[model samples]
Target: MEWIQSLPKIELHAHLNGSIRDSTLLELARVLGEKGVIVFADVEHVIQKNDRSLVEVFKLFDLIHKLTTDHKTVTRITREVVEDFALENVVYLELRTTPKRSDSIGMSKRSYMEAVIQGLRSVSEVDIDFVRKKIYVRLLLSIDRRETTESAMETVKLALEMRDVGVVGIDLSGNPLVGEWSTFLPALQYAKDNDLHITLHCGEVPNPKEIQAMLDFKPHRIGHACFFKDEDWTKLKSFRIPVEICLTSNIVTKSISSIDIHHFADLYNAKHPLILCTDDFGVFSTSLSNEYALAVRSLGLSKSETFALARAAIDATFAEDEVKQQLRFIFDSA
Candidate 1:
């Protein structure tokens, strides 16, 4: 248990606002309140206590989109999340978020990414000499399934612009129930054609057929896939694609009724590459360390096995080879 806490790890999937501190959300709410942008009532309604359906979850984010209308809030939250990951001993991270904007905010999709990049730059400027470890955080710009092909293209364009800054890949995120695989075909093709890494929020529900289709896309990773059907489950087992397992988010979102029945164990037993992650930590009130701890205590993993899992995660990271090598050296030395 102690070793799990101290082990250097790599997180391949995390959401930017999903990791925002509750206190910080409340503070941002206060700021919005003063500007008459959003009220405490809105905050209370949006930030719920427990599991929310995908529709409600997106509704909550819509409210946050209104609250965080400016660059400052985005930048501030980004810096804190990176530091929090550092505290969790995540030596490397690939954080994702769709560009934020609204009619009221007047922020362009490109400007939204700039604000986040500013936050990462802010963190890099800090002097954290006391901590015996270093954290290398990267960004992945996500495309919402609900967006039009034209809008998705805009997202890809923005992601490419920030690639040199931090963005390493593209992700398709949103309610799987809203759209079918055909909806985002162009965006996925664009990523593939342009040599951008890809991942999906696929199989959060029971969609084995679509899971198979996503695999055909050959993403570097997959998220959830908790409700895989029998045939598709076998296909996933045979492939090397890593699954980003967000235990608490699954339980909270009711993707799985409980962690006792979580599919991570099945994947682990099948020798599938699986990485524990916090899909939306702010919404679920969890962290990478907490998820790893849950895997140990609930799933019955040993310290050495957990350390190997950490190493596996780093090895499976989407970061550049040089960055991955540096992190591998740190984890090996640690």
Candidate 2:
């Protein structure tokens, strides 16, 4: 794990809200409890446990998002989440989040976005070497499965408008059980029409049609992908779109019964384009380095092979060619 920590890494699927520190969660919950917005005792248990049930994790989303509705809350959340990834030695992070709006919190997507930038600039300032060290970060605006087409379009339009300030792509994710294949099609089409990259949370459940449609759309990358039929396998292999693997979360969710039968095994052997990411670092209680260690331990990959797997993710990143050049240099030098 220590050696894996030393290696430069890229994490493409981390969620800003889910990567928050437990310390921060507790402190914020404590304040809210005093104010009667939340009860501290109940949330203390939720915050303490790492492995939560599927429904339990969503309950956390309800809890945390409610707790931090304003820009200051998000500013702190983003700062700490990014700082934690840096501590784990992730050189390039494509942090993803849905751009939320709340009149109650006085946070339009515009102010929420400025808050995100404020939080990031705070972290980048800490390391005068943030650029010199070749550590780069980009943001991907997410469209939740629960949103309307117009709402999703709003998010996409914001992504388009915010291009120069580090927003790189569109992320279609939320509860996989909800949302239709074509629910956000107009927005997704608009994004693609304007040349925005996309990544979807695909195939966590068994649905033949949605899987086919998602594949037909052919996102730049996909996440989870724990349940795929034989034909789905063939289609995915044919496209070879990179996947974000969440080893610990997969086990905790029982999406796969065991790490031994995880899709990482089949995908790695296929020489498929794949990279491991801590999908929800705070909620899953896993790190990018921890995922690498688990893959090596369970799959019997040599450290040399582990290094290569990490290196190959450079090509899958949404970074510019110049940034990719820096990533390749870091890996080659190491």
Candidate 3:
């Protein structure tokens, strides 16, 4: 654990709302409970649990959405999430979130995005060498699968507008069972045509048509890739698309039955480009270093091979080349 914690790491798939600290969630619930907004018991139950079915996972997200409706909570959670990653020696992070609007709380989508950027900016003010070296944080605006084509395009447009404010790319996320790949094609194309990078949540379920469609779309990267068929693996290899693997999230969501049977070894043996990540650090109760630790323990990775996997993610990051070079130097020096 100490060795893993000392290594510089990159985090690519962390969700903003799902990464809120448990204590923070409790406090938010307590405050909301006092205001009669939510039942304290309900929020507490979600926070305290260590295991959940996929359905229960979505329910927890709903509760989280309730707690993080306003700009203040959004900014606060973002800052704390960044700090938590930095404490774990994560040097580069790409945090993704669906820009939300709450009419009840008077929060617009733009304001929500602005609040996230503000949080990133606040953390960027510190010295680069602070803590275990500085952590570079970037944003990826998400288009929920449940949204209409127009709404998804609006998210892409918002991302383009905020490009200068550390918004690097667009993501297609949310419940995988809800929307079709064709529905998001145009919006994703618009992002690609405009030079914005993309990462899709592919193969989270066993939908062959949707998986092939996502593969055909040619994203810069894909997350989960949990339910790919044999042919789909060949297609993915042809594109050499980097995959973000979340070990604990998949296990907890029952995407994979257990760690030993995970596709991690399959991908590793195939020599595919991979990035180990925490899908939702707070929700899954996992860390970037802990993911590395699990890979070593469950995947039979030696110390040197573990470091190789950690360093391989540098080329997979969305940051500029200079930043990537800096990370390479960090790893090489270590």
Candidate 4:
């Protein structure tokens, strides 16, 4: 456990809104309660909820969104989240969040992302550059499947505009069952045309047609291949796209039936590129260090192997060569 805590980690699949500190959320909920914005008694129980199912998880996401509506909350949570990852010896992180345009909060999509950058710029405890003994944080704007191409493209445009200021790529994620494959592809294709790295929340459900289509697109990386069929695996392996694994989140949400039967075993054994990540630290009640230790025990990764995977993950990051060098340097010292 101590060794895992000290191991340098690369986190590639973290969501900014999903990673809010529980205490900070409670404080905000309490503030809303006093202002008649929320019923404190009704929500406190859900805030500390332990056993969340797949459908319930999205409800929690909705609750978190409600709790964090304003730019101040967004900025504070982004700042808190990066420090949380850095404190866990995460050498590099790519934080993803949907760019929201809320007239209620007087925030446009660009303004929302600007808040996230504001938070990233404000991190004082660790360097956002790849510096030794610290973590570097980057941002990926997620295009929720619930969004139409117009809004989805809007996020892609903002990501392209902010490329110089920590924005690295685009992610396609949301309620896996709600949207069709073709709905978001226009924006995804445009992002690709603009040379942006893409990662999708692929194969969470048994949708064969969409799964095959996404693999055809051949994104840079994928998260949660929980429902991939034999054919899907063959195609994905053919592409050799790296996968981001979230052991605790998958089990807690019941995305996979059990830890022993999870796909991490086959993927790791096949020597397919993989990176361990915390899908949501607060919701799953596990940190980045906690995930590394769990994989070793549950998936039978030896400590030496664990250290190697963590270090090798540098190559899988969307950040460029300079950041990779800094991450390599940090991992070497560890």
Model number with the top TM-score: 4
lDDT of 2 at 76: 88
- Where is model 1 more than 4 Å wrong at Cα? 45-50, 53-55, 124-132
List TM-score per model, in order.
0.93, 0.96, 0.96, 0.97
Q: Write the per-residue lDDT of candidate 3 for residues 1-334, one digit (tens) a residue.
A: 6989988889999999988888898888899999998889877876778355666788778778878889988888888888888888888889999999788778878999888877765665333321134787778999999999999998999989987777778999988789788889999999999988999998888999999999999999999998999999999999999999999999989998889888878889999999999999888888888888888998877788888999999988887777788888888988
Candidate whose lDDT is highest: 4
- As a whole number from 0 to 100, the lDDT of residue 162 in candidate 4 is 91
Error of 3 at 178 (Å): 0.4
lDDT of 3 at 239: 95
TM-score result, candidate 2: 0.96
Reference-based lDDT, residue 17, model 3: 93
Candidate 3 global lDDT: 0.87
Per-residue lDDT over 1-334 for candidate 4, one digit per residue giving the tens place of the 0 to 100 score: 6988978789999999888887898999999999998999877888777357888888878888888978998889988999999888887899999988789769999999888888887888776662244678778899998999888989999989998887888999989989887989999999989988999999988899999999999899999999999999999999999999999889988989898999988999999999999998988889999888888998777877898989888888889888888777877876
**Of models 1 and 2, which has the larger TM-score?**
2
Report model 3's TM-score to 2 decimal places. 0.96
lDDT of 1 by residue, 1-334 (tens): 5667677877877898778888888888887788886678768766865336655677777676666668888899888988888887887888898896665567888888888878877885332311144678778888887888888888988877777787778999987787778767788788778878888888877776788889888788889987788877777766788899988888877789888888899888877899988888887788888888998898687777888878887767767788778777887887
In terms of lDDT, the poorest run of 10 residues in model 1 is 124-133
